[PDB]
């Protein structure tokens, strides 16, 4: 289930490890864009804050969803900043949301003062005024309620059913990191010369066994004049040691 | 301009159905513009047939119209579509349509636009 | 639902002259959603005062509405020879809306 358009709700995500060839190679994502970064570029990049926005909208209103959009839909339930960061994924999914007897859960602002503010959590479910006469109490002439329930039926053909829309944005590099893409781990090569990047620490030598006791409070040996001669595996506890060439 | 125009007098038999329609030239019924239809007869006082929304939807009726009349607006093609059934000699009338000035902005309290009407009879 | 009654049923008064009607209800007290129309033979009707305040364009200033229950009175300083027409009161309670009688004025 997703939060309705008016009321969408807000996940968020920190202080993980987030992998997006899983994201990346699934099938039924139709819609897949992305403006301020590129999606192959988002698995070595660091991300401080990440927060996603899942609701579920019409086929019509897709376009809309677009930063610089307007529209009843675009103005009066959720709002894009000018300068948008992060993307949107977007599909159709007309088999779980759409019910066969008429699924009306689903509602959508009509009716408001003024267009929202962007990235706004906040919703009002009171009457709207047509006229300029005050109106309150119960719905008369000029005043209408401002929600109208969504009308999905498997019936429906493309342009009207329901569709399944994330959004996900995030800063770039304003806060310490959280959450970062997964790093390579190739094979180990002993006894020859090689460049080794032990856990960002690149160099030249040849890697050896060696019998010194590296205590997990030690975590990186070094020698009288202050030169790299022993590093720890991450993979394995092994100590290893450093010679030059 | 505002303008509005409706179909023509008409002579039917009884037992067929009948569309009623007026259409706005210029006009549009947008999200907040409602409208209603009224009836007049030879001689008699004005009586109210039903008013709804184009935006919501919400449809509302005499009590006396609650079985053989069905009104839909349609803002996409801008119409009012009447399907009447069962129509006697008391159904022998001029229909009108009126509507307020209110696209999407703001209006008053009343009906400003009316139209000339369709004089239908059923013999 | 409601059973309107509009006084005098017949007028007839000189031109120039100034003359005023009055509207009943039997529903509850209400003042700001009546309005009044005039309509001809043969012709539809007009909008001449709704909101028990405003006007609509190009209404005469000639119309005065009174009223602060129930009642609804229009008041005309002077009938001009287009104002014979029979006038109207209708409601908009959202409730089954039902026209008056009908206040007719003759020459």
């Known amino acids: 289930r997703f939060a309705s358009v008016y009321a969408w709700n807000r996940k968020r995500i920190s202080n993980c490890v987030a992998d997006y060839s899983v994201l990346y190679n699934l099938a039924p994502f139709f819609t897949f864009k992305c403006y301020g970064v590129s999606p192959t570029k988002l698995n070595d990049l660091c991300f401080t804050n990440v927060y996603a926005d899942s609701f579920v909208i019409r086929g019509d209103e897709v376009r809309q969803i677009a930063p610089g959009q307007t529209g009843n839909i675009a103005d009066y339930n959720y709002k894009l900043p000018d300068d948008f960061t992060g993307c949107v994924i977007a599909w159709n999914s007309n088999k779980l949301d759409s019910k066969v007897s008429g699924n009306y859960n689903y509602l959508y602002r009509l009716f408001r003062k003024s267009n929202l503010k962007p990235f706004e959590r906040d919703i009002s479910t009171e009457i709207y005024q047509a006229g300029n006469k005050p109106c309150n109490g119960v719905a008369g002439f000029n005043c209408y309620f401002p929600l109208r329930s969504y009308s999905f039926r498997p019936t429906y053909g493309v342009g009207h059913q329901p569709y399944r829309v994330v959004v996900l944005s995030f800063e770039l590099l304003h806060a310490p990191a959280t959450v970062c893409g997964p790093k390579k781990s190739t094979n180990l090569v002993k006894n020859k010369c090689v460049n080794f990047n032990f856990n960002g620490l690149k160099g030249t030598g040849v890697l050896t066994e060696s019998n010194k006791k590296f205590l997990p409070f030690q975590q990186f040996g070094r020698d009288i004049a202050d030169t790299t001669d022993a590093v720890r595996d991450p993979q394995t506890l092994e100590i290893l040691d450093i010679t030059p060439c | 301009q505002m303008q509005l125009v409706q179909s023509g007098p008409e002579v039917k038999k009884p037992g067929t159905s009948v569309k009623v329609s007026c259409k706005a030239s210029?006009?549009?019924?947008?999200?907040?513009?409602?409208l209603q239809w009224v009836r007049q007869a030879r001689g008699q006082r004005l009586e109210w047939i039903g008013w709804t929304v184009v935006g919501t939807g919400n449809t509302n009726y005499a009590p006396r119209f609650q079985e053989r009349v069905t009104i839909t607006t349609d803002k996409s093609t801008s119409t009012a579509y009447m399907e009447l059934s069962s129509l006697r000699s008391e159904d022998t009338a001029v229909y009108y349509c009126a509507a307020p000035f209110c696209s999407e902005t703001s209006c008053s309290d009343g009906f400003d636009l009316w139209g000339q009407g369709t004089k239908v009879t059923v013999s | 639902e409601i059973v309107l009654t509009q006084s005098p049923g017949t007028l007839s008064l000189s031109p120039g002259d100034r003359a005023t009607l009055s509207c009943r209800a039997s529903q509850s007290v209400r003042i700001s959603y009546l309005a009044w129309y005039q309509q001809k033979p043969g012709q539809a009707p007009r909008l001449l005062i709704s909101?028990?305040?405003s006007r609509a364009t190009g209404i005469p200033d000639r119309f005065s509405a009174s009223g602060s229950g129930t009642d609804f009175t229009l008041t005309i300083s002077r009938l001009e020879p287009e104002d014979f027409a029979v006038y109207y009161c209708?409601?908009?309670?959202?409730?089954?809306?039902?026209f008056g009688q009908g206040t007719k004025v003759e020459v």
């Open positions: 210029g006009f549009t019924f947008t999200d907040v513009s409602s």
């Open positions: 909101g028990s305040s």
């Open positions: 209708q409601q908009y309670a959202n409730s089954p809306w039902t």
